[PDB]
Every structure is written in C-alpha cells, then in structure tokens.
Design a protein around this ligand. Structure first.
Ligand SMILES: [Mg+2]
Ligand SMILES: [Mg+2]
Ligand SMILES: [Mg+2]
Ligand SMILES: [Mg+2]
Ligand SMILES: [Mg+2]
Ligand SMILES: [Mg+2]
Ligand SMILES: [Mg+2]
Ligand SMILES: [Mg+2]
Ligand SMILES: [Mg+2]
Ligand SMILES: [Mg+2]
Ligand SMILES: [Mg+2]
Ligand SMILES: [Mg+2]
Ligand SMILES: [Zn+2]
Ligand SMILES: [Zn+2]
Lengths: 87, 386, 94, 150, 131, 136
RNA sequence: UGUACAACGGGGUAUUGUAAGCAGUAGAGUAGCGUUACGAUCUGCUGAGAUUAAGCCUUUGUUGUCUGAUUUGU
RNA sequence: GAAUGUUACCGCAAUAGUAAUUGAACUUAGUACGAGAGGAACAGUUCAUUCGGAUAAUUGGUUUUUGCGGCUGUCUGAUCAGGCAUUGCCGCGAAGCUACCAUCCGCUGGAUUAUGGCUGAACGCCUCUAAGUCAGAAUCCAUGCUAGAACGCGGUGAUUUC
RNA sequence: GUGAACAGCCUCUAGUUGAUAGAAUAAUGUAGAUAAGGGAAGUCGGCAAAAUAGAUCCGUAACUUCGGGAUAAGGAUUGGC
C-alpha cells in the first residue's frame, strides 16, 4: 500500500485538486461573500430605520501614556542591565 | 533479550503531555492560507455544543454499496447566534515570528463582553474602556493613526469578536472573546472591512454554508485522575494479583535505571485540547425558521429542538449548525469552527446532503414521539383533560 | 455507458433514476414524494378516490352533528346544597 | 423510510429506535423499547398488560371500530405518482386526524359519564356519616369569624 | 437484567411460540404428524411422548402422564385458548389494517376455532386412552 | 472479503470467535460446524479471530455424516445471534448462529438452505442467494 | 435593587404499571334459612396513583435575600 | 505555587514530542501479452485490517434514582402505611458512566538514497562526475497536531479619598 | 413464629447502643455483585467463580467381600383459594 506521503498519490491528488474541487471552493467563497455583504446591508438598513424614529503619519509615539511607559521601561532596563539588544 | 511477540505500543506519543488544558476555550493553532485575490472572509466562528440527534440521509454516492439508498447517521448540533465584531489586531513578521503591533477597539462595547475583563462584576465600578471611548471624539485622532499603522505595517489581520451568550439558555452571562483571521483582499481592505463592521454582527451563514467540510476545535470532557488501564488501554493483570491488577506489571526491566517517558502512568484523563477535521455540515438552520427541523420528505412543522429540550442545555432559538458525527467536548461547551486548511480532494466534500428526516424525540428517556401533539394524539384523552 | 464516460466515468457519474418515469406531466419527474406527516406514513393514506371517501366521512360527520353527537343538580338537592356537601366532604377527608 | 408500530405495545417505531427480532419462520418483531423487547422475551401477554394498546382495545378503554380508522392500510398495489393526488392526500390526512381526535374525545366522555353522580353520592354518605367532625368544623368556622370580626 | 431472567430467557435457550403452537394444533394432519414421529436419537424418549401444547418431549409415558396432570400444562392450555396475538393485533391496536384484523378474528371465530378445539379434544381422548 | 464474494463488505458486529459451534443450515448432512479459523481476519496480540454474518470460516463437522466428519471445509455464516446494526435504521438478531458448507469459490455443497438467510450474506454471495428460499 | 438570585409551587419531558376507598352479582364451591353468609381472584371509578434533578427543559404565581473579611501603587 | 508597580484580557513561538498502516473491490477488462491455458498496471472511484484521538443521537451493559411494582419470613391488633432480613429477593428502570457490543474523524510542501539521465573533461576515443546539472524511496526536514520556557516575549483595558 | 430442627431470619422478657469523629466520593486496593455474543480459545494446571441443592413421585449401570455401589445416572412436580 502507498503511504499518505507517497509522491505519485500526492501528484495525482494535486492534479485532481487544481480542477473541480477548487472550482467548487471558489463558487462557495463567492456565495458566502455575497451573503456577508447582504447581511451587512440588512444591518445598515435596520439601523437606519431605527434611527428614523430617533430623528496619516505613523511616526512618533502612540500616545502620552505609551511614551511615558516606554521611556520608563527602557530606563529601567538600562539601570538593571536586563536589555536584550543594548549594553 | 528481544520481546518474543511484537505488538504496537499503547497510545499516541504525539498527544503528550496528558495534562489539563490551559483554558476552557481551545486555541486555533493554524488559519487557512491567505489568497490576496479572494474577497474578505472570516476564517472561523464560535458556537456552543448543544447536543446530538439522529437523521436519515438520502445518499447519492456513486460506486458505493449504499448508492441510491437511505442511511441513518448521527449528528451534532451547535447553537450559533451571530458574533459581534468589536476589535482588530495587526501582526507583523519578525525574525522571531509573528508579533502583534497594535489593537483597535470599537467605540461601544456591551456589558456582555465587558464582563470578560472582570473577576467580580457585581462589586466593580464597570470602568472598562471608559477612557478608551473618549479617543473617538473630535475626528477620531489616535484611532485613525493606529488604523493607518496597521495598514502600513501589518502582514496579518485578525478581528476580535465575541459571542452573544445572552441568547443561549446558558446560566453564564460572561461572553467569549476571540481572534478570527481575515482571509481575503489586501491589508488595507481587511482594515476597512473591520472598521466598517465595528459593533456589527456576523451570522453563521455568512461564514459557512451547507455541504462544507469544517474543523472543530475544543477542549474534551474532563474525567479527573484515571488509572493506566483506561487512560492508555493496557491489558488487565490476572485475578487477585498482588498490589493490584489495573496496573502495568513491569515499568522497567533494563539498564537505564529510570522510568521511561514512553511508559504508561496514571494521571489526568480528558480536558485536553483537540482539533478534529473534516466534519460535513448537514444543515445551516436559521433561528427565524418555524420549520428548521423539517425536510422535503417530512412535512411535519417542527423545530430542531427535541421534546423536553436538549438534556442539560435547553432549547435552540438561534441559528444552528448540524454536522454529522461527533466533535470534541461535551454539551454547552464553547467550540471553534474553522475553515479547512486545504482543498479536500475526496468526493465526500463534493457530495450534496439531502436529509429526509430529523429526529426530535425526547433524549431524557426512550422517546417515542416527535411532537407533543403526536403524543397527545397517540395517547388520547386523559383524566385531567376531561 | 457512453453518457457515463462523457460525464464522469465509472464511479463518479450520478445517474438520475427519475428520468425514465412515465408520468402524466413531464414536470413531475423531479418531484420529491413526501413520506412522513405528523407521525403518519403518507404511503398508506395514498389512494385514488380518497376525495370521495373523505366526502363520505364529512357526510357522516354532518349527520352526527345534526343528531347532536358532540355536546350539578340532583333530585331533592339544590346547586348550593350540593356545593356545600362537596366542600364539607372535602373538609372531612382532609 | 417508514414508521413501524411496536409488536408489543403498538407505539411508533422511528428509524434508529428499538430492536428487531427475526424468527425461524421469517417473522419480524419490532419493539420500540427494551421494555417491550424484554417483556416479549419473558413471554408476557400484551393483552394482559394494562399499558398496551392491545389491552386497551380488548378492554374497551378506547374506540376500535370507526370509519376514520379505515383510511390507513398497507398498499401492496402501488399507484403512479400524481402531484394533485399527493396534495389531496396531505390535506385529507389532517382532516381525518382532527375528526378522529374529536370522535375519541366523545368516546372517552361517554365512557366517563356517571363519575360526578357517584362522587356526589359518596360525598353525601360521608357527610351523613360524620356529624362530630362537622360540629368541630362549625366551631372552628365560628371562632375564625369572631376573630375576623374583632 | 437479573441473573435468573437472563439464564432462563437467553436467546440460545428460546422456546417455541404460542402462535406457532396454535397453528400446529389447528390442523388434524399436523397433530397426526406430531403424534407419529420418526425415532430420533437426539430427542428424549426416542422422539415419542411429545406434548404439542408445551412443545416438550418426555422420556417416558408416565412422565407425559404426570405432565398432563399438572398446572403448567393447564397454564399452557389456558394460554392457547384465544387469539394467538399476531402482528395484526398490534397493528389494529395502533389503528392499522383494522379491516384485515377484523377479518382474521372472524375467520378464527368461524373456521379455525372450532376445528382446533375438536382436534384438541381428540388429542386429549387419545392421550387418555393410550395412557 | 474472500475469494468468490461479490464486492466489498461493511463492518458487522462479530459474534462467532474461534471455538464457537453453529448450526448447519444446508442439506449436505452436517448438523453443526465448529469454527477453527476466520478467512480475512487481521492480526493482533491476544485477540481471537471472529466472524460475523456473511463471513467465510474454516470449520470441522462435529455432528452429522461420518464421511463429512474429520475434515476441514470452508463455510459461510448465514445467521448470527449477536445483534448488529443495519443502515436502514434498526439493530437486529437471529435466534441462532448458522452457516452453510461451501468451496473456496463460494459455491454451496448442498442444494437448498433451511431457515432465513441474512440479507448481507445473500447480497455478498450469489450462490447463497441462489440456494436461499427465505431471505430475511 | 434587578430579561437579579434563592426556596417552594405550576406546566412540560421521562420511569413504572392501574393507588386508597367504595361497589358489583363476575367468582371454584361450602353452611344456614330462591335468598343470605364466607370466599383466591375478576371488573368499574383508574394509562390511574407514585416519582420526575440531586449534573432534564421552562416559569406573568408565593415567600425571602442582596453581606461580611483581607490585601495590593509605576 | 512567592518574586521582580497591581490587576485583567487577547496573543507570539524557542524548545520538546509527533502517526498513521495494510488488504480487498468497481472501472481500466477478459484489454495489453499469449497456439493455448491463462492474464496485468497507471489515471478515475468504493470499502475494510491494525493503530490513534474523540463521542453517547441510537443499540447493548450497569442500578442506592433504593424511581415504580411484585414475592418469602417475621413484627407494628386488622385495612392503610411501614420496620428488619450486614444493598433480603425478583421484574422494569431514567440520569450518569461506558463498548470494534456503539458512532464519528485521522494531510501536504521542499531536500534526498539506490537508480535512470544531461552537458562535459581527466585521456585529441569514450565516460552520469571531476566543476556543473535533471528526476527519483513508505527516507530526512518542514506543513499540520500536543505542551508552552513556571527566571522567553508582544499588544490591549482599568488603575484606590482618609 | 417459619421450618425436620438448639440451623438461618424476625419477635417478647432481660440487657446493650460500646469500638476517635466531621466533610468530600480521584486513581490503586480490601470485601461483595452484574454483564451482550462466544463458551476454557485463558493458565503449568478450570486456580477462582458459576452451575447443583429442600421435599414428593417415576426410575437408577458396571463392579462387588452380596453387606453395598446409591441421593448413582436420568426425568416430573411444588403458590393461593
Ligand atoms: Mg438520553
Ligand atoms: Mg497471549
Ligand atoms: Mg519542532
Ligand atoms: Mg490508481
Ligand atoms: Mg476509548
Ligand atoms: Mg413483609
Ligand atoms: Mg557526454
Ligand atoms: Mg510562560
Ligand atoms: Mg457473558
Ligand atoms: Mg488451552
Ligand atoms: Mg495460550
Ligand atoms: Mg460410582
Ligand atoms: Zn413498545
Ligand atoms: Zn403440556
């Protein structure tokens, strides 16, 4: 018997896999994407109906808390000599 | 000297150590490979195992002995109300592996997901994300910068979603929060999808569909401390053997002067993380369908819920997934349903399921009736009815 | 076998067995025949002139209703008296 | 696919339920439950066990001969498929079930008439036979009424 | 479940059924065939002295006589009196093949019943004469 | 599945291990069959070979004709007392375990089979189905 | 201080197999004067009665409860 | 399970382990091959053996549910309702547990070995080899699966009024 | 009282209620049970368990020191009124 790792069986599997199985997978993905878009649109419509009744640079620090914490942490690592990359 | 008779070893060495899992929710170790041409989609979903029942299938399988015949098969029911998208996480590639760069949360988070961050919800002031919500004011600076950072640097995009456990019959009020990988277009498109879907729900039929092979990831049912005989399947010793018969007679008879790691020992059984694959979805039932338990062959108007409800779980009032066979975990445990990591080349993945009948008899006994109306019609008029 | 070979070959081709049906309407070939309804088998109710049989049953039911098929005081006792008797007897048993 | 009736108690046997025993003369005995199977193996009489439809029909607890009970029989001569005939059969099954339920209700009511008369006679005899308890009851009621008044 | 019921009513220790015994007793030819059996060495009493009602072989004529003078045989005879409870009885009790069950009961009452009773009486007097 | 069988066989609960005695259901003169081997059986330590409905075994005649006795012959199991599951939706069992005497090609020695014959065995062996008078 | 929790109760869902009491003209016969008395059992009220979470489902009802102790800071 | 502000949630993956195996069947086909007698395989499909991991819808086993009913002996004056008989005994028995006695699931990329080659010297022939290079084993390393360094790490929430 | 019975089981008179306790119900044990289909295939070895068992009736071989073997073997029955 040929093992699961047999080269000829895996080659035949790949030849089969590039065809009808992949076609079915692609069709299922398209249908699922359509249903997802419809679900989002229905949620938007319901939210609009509910509200009817009621009616970039990434440089620098993330925020001041992040700046303070990271500076304190790097100073602590420098003081305690527990840094991975800096002496 | 050599063992006289050959025999395979007892148990699998690749499922070691047999310790309790670190969490009640099993981790997803691998997501399907991302194809940048495809539309954006979730790679997984979260649900609660409700129980099992029985179906009859009109089988179409050419070349099989049961071609054009009926087969009775066991199925598992997973209650799957829609998940709520509440966050996004970006991951960058480093020589040490994947690293989370940033996480962006939605403006409003429900108390159901806020309870996950508390050990004592009733005594707490419920201050979670209160200062975070203020960052959406005056044009959303900070939020926009972190989203741009994810767009610029991240190579993997995941979305933080949580279950709506208040729609289940469970006594637990604390929701489950998890990361689900987004497989689809570009990184910018994934970030835009997450931002547009913040605070929005995703249903199960917008992730999976019928006749699809999926994977179940969950923690198995625990059993406490167990002996070697039932932990590893070893043969029992003869009757009235000294010092017990539910043991391995000789744990070592050779030079190393140690107990080998591959020798069966008593310890914890169950409550292990398992990832089982290739479970076929037999039905994606909707919660608003009055006859989601009916078929084209069985015209009885009934739901999926059995008589008296599922034992130890309750009724099914949301969308559900019916897969054939069994999945790891017991009833009311949280399970993760994952997309297949490869394009399956077996014809079972291409087979189309047509159910003829779904069993809804009581699982609390030897149930003989599918509906209370059927039970009343069979029994007739009782003393209290007159 | 030629159709099988051109479609899928042996072991892949799924033959439609309903294509050979000799029915009154050709659109009825791919019809799913129901089998179960409210705990009853439809096959042992399926019968020609079941409409006439049901009409005869309805006539019998009309006759029974006309005859009056579907539809507190005793000699020497009043309704309040028997209510008091029942209440006192329940008290005695308790 | 077919719903079978239990050989012992006549309950419905859905697919995947109960157990079947085949005798040397090719007779199939289908049991809905291990209870019925074990009773059959112990060779008890289903017409003597009160919880069976055989006993109920034999003892007259429920109606056995009716025009509504003749619409279901095994069809050994098949009929060609017809969509309108199938729809007519599906409507007729519900109508027949409703009529049969009404007739069974009327049968049970006719069987159980007289219970109120018997209960009234029993209550009258008990009241006539127990004067002392009634005096105690009257004293208790009078004391409770005096307590409510004051 | 219990040991007594298990070791009495195990599948491999099963006995002949009441409907089959009733069918055996119904016809005179079957009664004659069971009364005149070939000499079998695997049966007690060389296949002779066979009680049809209990479907039981005896080693001796005195054993058969004592069995006839017993409550177990009387219990079997009392059981074999009415309808043998085929599948049609349960079907009609559920509301299925009611006309077929009624026709079967009428045929049992009219033709099968009295002939079986006469065959039983003839068997009883034959056993009394030969014993 | 053995030589002479018609196609593949799905798994049936095993009821007859080596050393079991079953009845003989044909008219070749044998009364019982004593199972000494099971054709197509696997290999595992301490595990006895066992046969189910529709299997071919090697058997010796214990009761019957002396000419048939003191020999080893192929047999096919046609009835078993251990309950097994049918894919139509019921568990079922027979009164007794019963087999028929055959050849390595799956052809019956006798001319008829007395009693019921299992559907699985009749479908797997054409000669059993040909010599069967009762099939379930 | 609430789709709040708990203890009961209600409704389902299951298990068993027809409760206590009363009555009959059903009851092998026997004793006394067709009747009465005893009488295994049988029949009716009665798929009745009992149990149903302790690791079943659900709840427009009743009654209560919502509180103490310890520690943790860049 | 202490400690490196406290506490909480979501994660990364060094390292360690690792798993699947064999047989039969349909089709190819009574085809290639063959006086005959006989008689394959690749590609496309279907089941099973051994092993492993789960699971209790169904069937079966189990019963202190002492849940329901019954039986013997004795005791509470009898009925009712019960005690004891070191779980008295018998039948059924849900729930739970559990069975190759039950059901489900167990994959796919790179580099190679033997060997078959390409270009090509050594050696003005030749040469698969020396430089270089194409394929190729159930092999190796990975994908996948299990654990997660209690002194490996990241992202994120909240951060005390006597 | 049951029963052949100073047996076993239950009760009257009399006498005890003593033996460190409480809370949970993992593995392995000690003591006791049940188990589908097969029925000794287990093991040096049917070790251990299971099966039998009271009473009444029918019937009971080789051998023998004629006294036995013998309850040989093999069959049927058992309640209440
Ligand atoms: Mg259940
Ligand atoms: Mg061995
Ligand atoms: Mg590794
Ligand atoms: Mg091939
Ligand atoms: Mg296991
Ligand atoms: Mg008692
Ligand atoms: Mg060259
Ligand atoms: Mg760690
Ligand atoms: Mg056994
Ligand atoms: Mg041996
Ligand atoms: Mg051995
Ligand atoms: Mg002797
Ligand atoms: Zn039944
Ligand atoms: Zn007899």
């Amino acid at each position: 018997a040929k093992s699961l790792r047999a080269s000829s069986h895996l080659n035949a599997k790949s030849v089969k896999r590039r065809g009808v199985f992949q076609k079915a997978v692609d069709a299922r993905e398209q249908r699922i994407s359509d249903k997802l878009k419809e679900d989002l649109l229905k949620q938007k419509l319901e939210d609009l109906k509910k509200k009817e009744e009621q009616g970039i640079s990434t440089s620098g620090w993330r925020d001041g808390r992040h700046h303070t914490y990271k500076k304190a942490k790097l100073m602590k690592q420098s003081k305690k000599k527990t840094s991975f990359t800096r002496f | 000297s050599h063992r006289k008779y050959e025999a395979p070893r007892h148990g699998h060495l690749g499922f070691l150590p047999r310790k309790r899992a670190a969490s009640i929710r099993a981790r997803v170790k691998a997501f399907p490979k991302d194809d940048r041409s495809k539309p954006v989609a979730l790679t997984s979903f979260l649900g609660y195992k409700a129980g099992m029942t029985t179906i009859v299938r009109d089988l179409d399988r050419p070349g099989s002995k049961f071609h054009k015949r009926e087969v009775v098969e066991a199925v598992t029911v997973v209650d799957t109300p829609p998940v709520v998208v509440v966050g996004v996480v970006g991951y960058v590639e480093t020589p040490r592996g994947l690293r989370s760069l940033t996480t962006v949360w939605a403006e409003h988070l429900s108390d159901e997901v806020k309870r996950r961050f508390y050990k004592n919800w009733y005594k707490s002031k419920k201050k979670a994300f209160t200062k975070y919500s203020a960052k959406y004011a005056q044009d959303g600076a900070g939020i926009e910068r972190e989203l741009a950072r994810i767009k610029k640097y991240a190579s993997v995009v995941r979305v933080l979603v949580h279950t709506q456990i208040r729609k289940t019959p469970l006594a637990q009020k604390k929701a489950h929060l998890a990361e689900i990988q987004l497989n689809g277009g570009s990184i910018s498109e994934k970030v835009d999808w997450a931002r547009e879907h913040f605070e929005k729900t995703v249903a199960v039929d917008s992730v999976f569909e019928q006749n699809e092979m999926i994977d179940a990831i969950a923690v198995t049912k625990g059993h406490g401390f167990e002996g070697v005989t039932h932990r590893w399947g070893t043969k029992k010793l003869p009757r009235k053997t000294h010092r017990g018969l539910r043991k391995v007679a000789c744990i070592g008879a050779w030079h190393p002067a140690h107990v080998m790691w591959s020798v069966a020992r008593a310890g914890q059984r169950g409550y292990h993380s398992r990832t089982s694959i290739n479970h076929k979805i037999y039905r994606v039932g909707k919660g608003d369908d009055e006859a989601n338990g009916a078929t084209s062959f069985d015209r009885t108007k009934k739901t999926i819920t059995p008589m008296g409800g599922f034992v130890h779980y309750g009724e099914i009032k949301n969308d559900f997934i019916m897969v054939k066979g069994c999945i790891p975990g017991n009833r009311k445990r949280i399970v993760t349903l994952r997309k297949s990591l490869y394009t399956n080349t077996s014809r079972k993945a291409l087979e189309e399921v047509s159910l003829k009948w779904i069993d809804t008899a009581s699982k609390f006994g030897k149930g003989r009736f599918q509906t209370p109306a059927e039970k009343h019609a069979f029994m007739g008029t009782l003393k209290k009815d007159l | 076998r030629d159709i099988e070979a051109e479609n899928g070959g042996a072991g892949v081709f799924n033959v439609n067995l309903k294509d050979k049906y000799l029915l009154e309407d050709d659109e009825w070939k791919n019809d799913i025949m129901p089998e179960i309804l409210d705990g009853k088998n439809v096959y042992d109710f399926l019968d020609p002139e079941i409409a006439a049989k049901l009409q005869a049953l309805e006539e019998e039911e009309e006759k029974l209703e006309n005859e009056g098929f579907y539809n507190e005081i005793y000699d020497g006792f009043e309704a309040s008296e028997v209510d008091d008797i029942k209440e006192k007897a329940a008290w005695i048993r308790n | 696919m077919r719903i079978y009736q239990c050989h012992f108690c006549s309950s419905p046997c859905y697919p995947g339920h109960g157990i079947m025993f085949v005798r040397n003369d090719a007779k199939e005995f289908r049991f809905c439950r291990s209870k019925c199977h074990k009773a059959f193996k112990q060779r008890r009489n289903p017409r003597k066990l009160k919880w069976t439809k055989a006993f109920r029909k034999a003892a007259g607890k429920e109606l056995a001969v009716d025009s509504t009970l003749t619409f279901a029989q095994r069809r050994n001569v098949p009929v060609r498929y017809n969509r309108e005939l199938v729809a007519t059969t599906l409507k007729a099954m519900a109508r027949i079930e409703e009529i049969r339920q009404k007739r069974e209700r009327a049968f049970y009511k006719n069987r159980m008439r007289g219970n109120k008369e018997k209960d009234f006679l029993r209550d009258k005899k008990l009241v006539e036979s127990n004067p002392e308890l009634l005096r105690i009851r009257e004293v208790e009621i009078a004391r409770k009424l005096a307590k409510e008044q004051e | 479940m219990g040991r007594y019921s298990v070791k009495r009513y195990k599948t491999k220790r099963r006995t002949r059924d009441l409907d089959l015994i009733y069918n055996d007793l119904s016809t005179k030819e079957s009664v004659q065939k069971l009364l005149n059996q070939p000499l079998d060495e695997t049966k007690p009493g060389l296949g002779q002295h066979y009680c049809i009602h209990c479907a039981k072989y005896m080693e001796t004529a005195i054993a058969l006589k004592t069995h006839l003078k017993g409550k177990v045989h009387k219990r079997r005879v009392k059981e074999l009196r009415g309808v043998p409870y085929t599948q049609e009885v349960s079907d009609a009790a559920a509301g299925y093949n009611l006309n077929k069950f009624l026709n079967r009961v009428q045929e049992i009452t009219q033709s099968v019943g009295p002939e079986k009773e006469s065959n039983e009486a003839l068997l009883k007097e034959h056993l009394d004469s030969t014993l | 599945s053995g030589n002479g069988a018609q196609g593949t066989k799905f798994r049936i609960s095993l009821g007859l291990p080596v050393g079991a005695i079953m009845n003989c259901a044909d008219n070749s003169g044998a009364r019982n069959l004593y199972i000494i081997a099971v054709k197509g059986s696997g290999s595992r330590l301490n595990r006895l070979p066992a046969a189910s409905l529709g299997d071919m075994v090697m058997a010796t005649v214990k009761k019957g004709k002396p000419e048939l006795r003191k020999k080893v012959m192929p047999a096919i199991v046609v009835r078993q007392a251990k309950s097994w599951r049918r894919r139509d939706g019921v568990f079922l069992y027979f009164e007794d375990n019963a087999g028929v005497i055959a050849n390595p090609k799956g052809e019956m020695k006798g001319s008829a089979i007395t009693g019921p014959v299992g559907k699985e065995c009749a479908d797997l062996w054409p000669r059993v189905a040909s010599n069967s008078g009762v099939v379930v």
